[PDB]
Each structure stands twice: as C-alpha cells, then as structure tokens.
Amino acid sequence: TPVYVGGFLARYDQSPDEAELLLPRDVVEHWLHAVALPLNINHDDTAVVGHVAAMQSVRDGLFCLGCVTSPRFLEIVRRASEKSELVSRGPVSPLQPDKVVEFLSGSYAGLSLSSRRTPFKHVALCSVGRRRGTLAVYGRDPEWVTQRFPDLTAADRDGLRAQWQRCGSTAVDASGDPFRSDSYGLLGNSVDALYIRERLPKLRYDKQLVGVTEESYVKA
Amino acid sequence: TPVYVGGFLARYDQSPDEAELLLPRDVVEHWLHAVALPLNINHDDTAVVGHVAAMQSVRDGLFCLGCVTSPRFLEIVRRASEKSELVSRGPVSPLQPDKVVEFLSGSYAGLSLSSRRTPFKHVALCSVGRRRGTLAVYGRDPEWVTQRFPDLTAADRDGLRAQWQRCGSTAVDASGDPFRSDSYGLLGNSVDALYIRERLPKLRYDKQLVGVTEESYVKA
Amino acid sequence: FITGHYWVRFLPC
Amino acid sequence: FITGHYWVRFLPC
Structure with a gap:
C-alpha cells in the first residue's frame, strides 16, 4: 500500500x-492560480x-496532502522499521500497529516547501520544518x-478531496517508481536531524x- | 584504517x-580484577x-578506549557520511576533514556500558548515554x-597505553570482521535517537x- | 528557491 | 544486565 x-x-x-x-495569503493564493509536484526526502532530487x-x-x-508511493523507498522503511525500539513500543489506543507508518511518523515528522523568492518547486519530508x-x-x-x-472546515476538505480523487492519465498502465536513492542516503540524512x-x-x-x-x- | x-x-x-x-569506585575496581569485550551499536549482538x-x-x-574495526560497518559509515549536510560543513580548525570520524562523532556521540546487577558484558556506541x-x-x-x-593524569594514560599496545594472538594471520548487521538496522536505530x-x-x-x-x- | 528546511536552505533556480 | 542506554535498558543473563 502507499502511505498518505x-x-x-x-x-x-x-x-x-x-x-x-x-x-502570506495573498502570495500563496495567487501562486496556486499560476504536472504534480514531486515529494522528496530532505530536498534531495534523487x-x-x-x-x-x-x-x-x-x-x-x-x-x-502528499502521497508516498515508492516501492524502493517503502521497502527501505519496512526493513528499517523492524529495527526501531520506538516502533516496537507501538501506537496509542485504539490504532493498529503499522510499522511503516510509525517509522515515517517518527523519522520524517516535518514538512518543508521549496518555493520561489512556476512558483512552487516541490515538497520535502524532513525531520522538522523550519x-x-x-x-x-x-x-x-x-x-x-x-x-x-x-480546524479544517468541510469546505476545506471538499477542495482537498477533489484533488486526491482526480484520476491521473488513463494512458500508461503502470505506476512508475521515482526513487533514485538508497538507505545510505537516508542514514546520511539522519545525523543532520540529530543536530537541529x-x-x-x-x-x-506544531x-x-x-x-x-x-x-x-x-511520535512527538 | 580503524577508528579509535x-x-x-x-x-x-x-x-x-x-x-x-x-x-561506585569500590565496585568498578573489584570488577576490573575479576578475551576482550565486544563493541556493538545500540546493544545489538549483530x-x-x-x-x-x-x-x-x-x-x-x-x-x-574502544576500537572500531569492522570493514562492513566502516563502509556503511563511509557511504552514509557522503550524504550528511553536517559532515559537509566540516570540523573545527585546525583538524583535517575526516568524513568517517565526523559521522561517528555525530551519530554515536554516547557510550553505554552493559554490566551486571563475568561482570562487564560489552560496550555499546549509541546516540547519548543514560x-x-x-x-x-x-x-x-x-x-x-x-x-x-x-583531566586524565600521565599515570592514567600509561595504564591505558599498556592495554591498546599489547599484541593480540600471533596465531591467526587475519583480522576477522564481527559485524553481522546492516545499514537498515542503523537506520532503524536512528529514529529512537531522535526521541531521546x-x-x-x-x-x-557531558x-x-x-x-x-x-x-x-x-559535533555537540 | 527558499526552503523551509534547517540544512538545505537555498536551492538553485 | 543493566545498560546505560535510553531504549535497551535491561539485558538477559
């Protein structure tokens, strides 16, 4: 399964x-008026x-609302999740243990936009946002x-629902895996997170x- | 090279x-009176x-004074070190950049003894000691x-020097690699370090x- | 580009 | 065994 x-x-x-x-609201909204941004890990193109x-x-x-699809990445997360003492302890009642979701929840707790000053470039998962x-x-x-x-209104949710329910190109009959990095990279990224x-x-x-x-x- | x-x-x-x-001093010293302890990562036998x-x-x-020898481990550290923004920034003057040492310095900043209550079992490298x-x-x-x-005296250093200069068995003409884990484990360990x-x-x-x-x- | 990150702050454009 | 660790605190003996 993918993770949202x-x-x-x-x-x-x-x-x-x-x-x-x-x-600000003026700038963000005008930018949303001006084909789907990539989700990366700590702003690494790979x-x-x-x-x-x-x-x-x-x-x-x-x-x-981003979507984590990569089989190569989610497989790294899977193998790493079975080696975390945090993940072993579990989630709060009444949620089912989900090692993959729990690890991402712990490891990449923040969001970070990459934007100008087209105006939005991509979104990075990271340990904490600035x-x-x-x-x-x-x-x-x-x-x-x-x-x-x-605090999201039902008006807000409808606008969001519209976007993630919208069907992609009916043309290609596969789902590509964009991930071009490794567990060594994710390990390399981890030290930095310790020094924030x-x-x-x-x-x-937050x-x-x-x-x-x-x-x-x-996990926080 | 190994790292000390x-x-x-x-x-x-x-x-x-x-x-x-x-x-206490009574207990520690009596224990040192009563063939060389393993160095592991977060008390993992593997x-x-x-x-x-x-x-x-x-x-x-x-x-x-422990000795980090594993080629399999130091090779994980090497590949991961080239993917850290902390390691990229470098060390304080006048030290030479040493990506491997810097990464371990950042990642495994603590020491943790495993002992009774033979009395000492092993030492673990970890993010922080308790x-x-x-x-x-x-x-x-x-x-x-x-x-x-x-604050170590020259009397103290001599006693230490004696031990790390002492020649191991002249019998086997190789140096074994004890490491039986992977980068997935080290990645798994990393989340936990974030939640201390x-x-x-x-x-x-410290x-x-x-x-x-x-x-x-x-790095601290 | 400006990011909301601690380590990768600016980004070529 | 007792460890000086945050996560792995006790250890079988």
Missing part, C-alpha cells in the same frame, strides 16, 4: 524569525518518494489523515497549534 | 536519577563493530583521543564535564 501524508507547508498565523520564510496529491489555502495556512506548524501526519487513508486536523537544536519542542509546538490531539501515529 | 573511541562509561562524581545506574582495547578506573570514572559524562570521542590515533580528555528528550543538552553537559574543550571532532 498531511500537513501545513506554511502558516498564516505564524511569523518566522527568518523574514525570508514569510509566505529521493523523490511520490507526489503532492492536493494543495489548499485554508483559514490558517497552506495545507497539502517554518512552524509544519507537522507531517502520515496514514493509510487520506480521508483519515485529513481528519486529524480538526530542540527539534522535539518545535514538533510539540502538534498543539494544528490541533493534532484528536488518536494519531505522531 | 575514548570516553567514560560511568562517572564517580555523577549521581544518576535511576539508582540502578549506580556504579552490530559488533570491534572491541574494548583498554579500561582504566581513574580519579573521576571508569574510562575506556549515565552522564559518557561522551564518545572518536579519532584515528588512540594517543590523540586519549589526549582529548585533559533533550539529547543535545545532555551531550553538552562535553564540558569531561573537559573536551581542548580541537576535537565532537
């Missing part, structure tokens, strides 16, 4: 320390794991992950802000 | 929160990367890593306590 990922890429109610990370299935400018931020509020929520059902975020100062308070901050306190796989 | 690792496994001047982690070359009860703690003062200092020269710790609450202040604490503020590869 939801979260904000930017937030309108959050003001970044680094002013370059500003991304670590594309899928695509952004939906994008929606909602009350509080730019929300997106913009606050950018918690990554993984799960098998996209309707389910989108429901993790309680106070990662876990940043993640805790969690309560976006109200992901509602059963989730989030 | 120095650090305390316990400290006499540090009192653990968990009383089970007590390990992740032996070498051996403890020396052990010395000094003024402040149980100090040890006992404080247990900073891992890596480097190519064992005389050099031992010199990172300024305030890892970096613990590491900073660093100044043992006076590793003297050019080092330590």
Whole structure:
C-alpha cells in the first residue's frame, strides 16, 4: 500500500524569525492560480518518494496532502522499521500497529516547501520544518489523515478531496517508481536531524497549534 | 584504517536519577580484577563493530578506549557520511576533514556500558548515554583521543597505553570482521535517537564535564 | 528557491 | 544486565 501524508507547508498565523520564510495569503493564493509536484526526502532530487496529491489555502495556512508511493523507498522503511525500539513500543489506543507508518511518523515528522523568492518547486519530508506548524501526519487513508486536523472546515476538505480523487492519465498502465536513492542516503540524512537544536519542542509546538490531539501515529 | 573511541562509561562524581545506574569506585575496581569485550551499536549482538582495547578506573570514572574495526560497518559509515549536510560543513580548525570520524562523532556521540546487577558484558556506541559524562570521542590515533580528555593524569594514560599496545594472538594471520548487521538496522536505530528528550543538552553537559574543550571532532 | 528546511536552505533556480 | 542506554535498558543473563 502507499502511505498518505498531511500537513501545513506554511502558516498564516505564524511569523518566522527568518523574514525570508514569510509566505502570506495573498502570495500563496495567487501562486496556486499560476504536472504534480514531486515529494522528496530532505530536498534531495534523487529521493523523490511520490507526489503532492492536493494543495489548499485554508483559514490558517497552506495545507497539502502528499502521497508516498515508492516501492524502493517503502521497502527501505519496512526493513528499517523492524529495527526501531520506538516502533516496537507501538501506537496509542485504539490504532493498529503499522510499522511503516510509525517509522515515517517518527523519522520524517516535518514538512518543508521549496518555493520561489512556476512558483512552487516541490515538497520535502524532513525531520522538522523550519517554518512552524509544519507537522507531517502520515496514514493509510487520506480521508483519515485529513481528519486529524480538526480546524479544517468541510469546505476545506471538499477542495482537498477533489484533488486526491482526480484520476491521473488513463494512458500508461503502470505506476512508475521515482526513487533514485538508497538507505545510505537516508542514514546520511539522519545525523543532520540529530543536530537541529530542540527539534522535539518545535514538533510539540506544531502538534498543539494544528490541533493534532484528536488518536494519531505522531511520535512527538 | 580503524577508528579509535575514548570516553567514560560511568562517572564517580555523577549521581544518576535511576539508582540502578549506580556504579561506585569500590565496585568498578573489584570488577576490573575479576578475551576482550565486544563493541556493538545500540546493544545489538549483530552490530559488533570491534572491541574494548583498554579500561582504566581513574580519579573521576571508569574510562575506556574502544576500537572500531569492522570493514562492513566502516563502509556503511563511509557511504552514509557522503550524504550528511553536517559532515559537509566540516570540523573545527585546525583538524583535517575526516568524513568517517565526523559521522561517528555525530551519530554515536554516547557510550553505554552493559554490566551486571563475568561482570562487564560489552560496550555499546549509541546516540547519548543514560549515565552522564559518557561522551564518545572518536579519532584515528588512540594517543590523540586519549589526549582529548585533559583531566586524565600521565599515570592514567600509561595504564591505558599498556592495554591498546599489547599484541593480540600471533596465531591467526587475519583480522576477522564481527559485524553481522546492516545499514537498515542503523537506520532503524536512528529514529529512537531522535526521541531521546533533550539529547543535545545532555551531550553538552557531558562535553564540558569531561573537559573536551581542548580541537576535537565532537559535533555537540 | 527558499526552503523551509534547517540544512538545505537555498536551492538553485 | 543493566545498560546505560535510553531504549535497551535491561539485558538477559
């Protein structure tokens, strides 16, 4: 199975320390007016794991819903998940153990947009986002992950649902695997994640802000 | 080349929160009186990367000097090191870039003894030790890593030097590779390291306590 | 490009 | 066995 990922890429109610990370409602919405962005791991062109299935400018931020498809990547995650003491401990009641989702939840807890200043380039899964509020929520059902975020209106969800339900090209009768990296890369990426100062308070901050306190796989 | 690792496994001047982690001078020294301990990664029997070359009860703690030998492990570290943004940034002047040492320095910053309550079982490299003062200092020269710790006396160093200079069995004319794990395991281990609450202040604490503020590869 | 990342901050365009 | 680890705390003997 593929894994779906939801979260904000930017937030309108959050003001970044680094002013370059500003991304207001006027700018985001005009950009969405101006064929589907790649999903990579720590902005590595060789670590594309899928695509952004939906994008929606909602009350509080730019929300997106990416799709992790790569068999090569998900197979790395599978083998690595069976060697984590965190994953072994399990998820909160009443969720079923899902080693693959739990590992991604732990390892790639953040979202990071790559944008100008076409205006959006791609989205990266990463340990923590530099913009606050950018918690990554993984799960098998996209309707389910989108429901993790309680402040999304039914108006917002409909706009999102429209995008991830939209059928791709009927032409090619296979699903390509974009992933051109390895577990060595993902291991290389891991050290860096350890040296982001106070990662876990940043993640805790993101969690309560976006109200992901509602059963989730989030490890923070 | 192999890589040497120095650090305390316990400290006499540090009192653990968990009383089970007590390990006093009487007990440590009597245990050293009662064929060389394996060095593994996060206490995984399949992740032996070498051996403890020396052990010395000094003024402040149980100090040890392990040796990371595995070609299979060091080759994983090599490939992963070329994919770290931390490793790319380099070490402090005036040290030469050493991607392998830098990665281990970042990734496995802690030491963890496995002991009773024969009394010592093995030593694990890990992200952070649960006992404080247990900073891992890596480097190519064992005389050099031992010199990172300024509070070790020349009496202490001589006792250590004796042990790592002592010739092994002249019988077998090869050096075996104990490592029976993979990069998937090391990747699996990495998530857990992310969820140790305030890892970096613990590491900073260890660093100044043992006076590793003297050019080092330590990333904390 | 500007990213919302800690390590890969800018990106060629 | 007792370890000085965060995740693998006890160890069979």
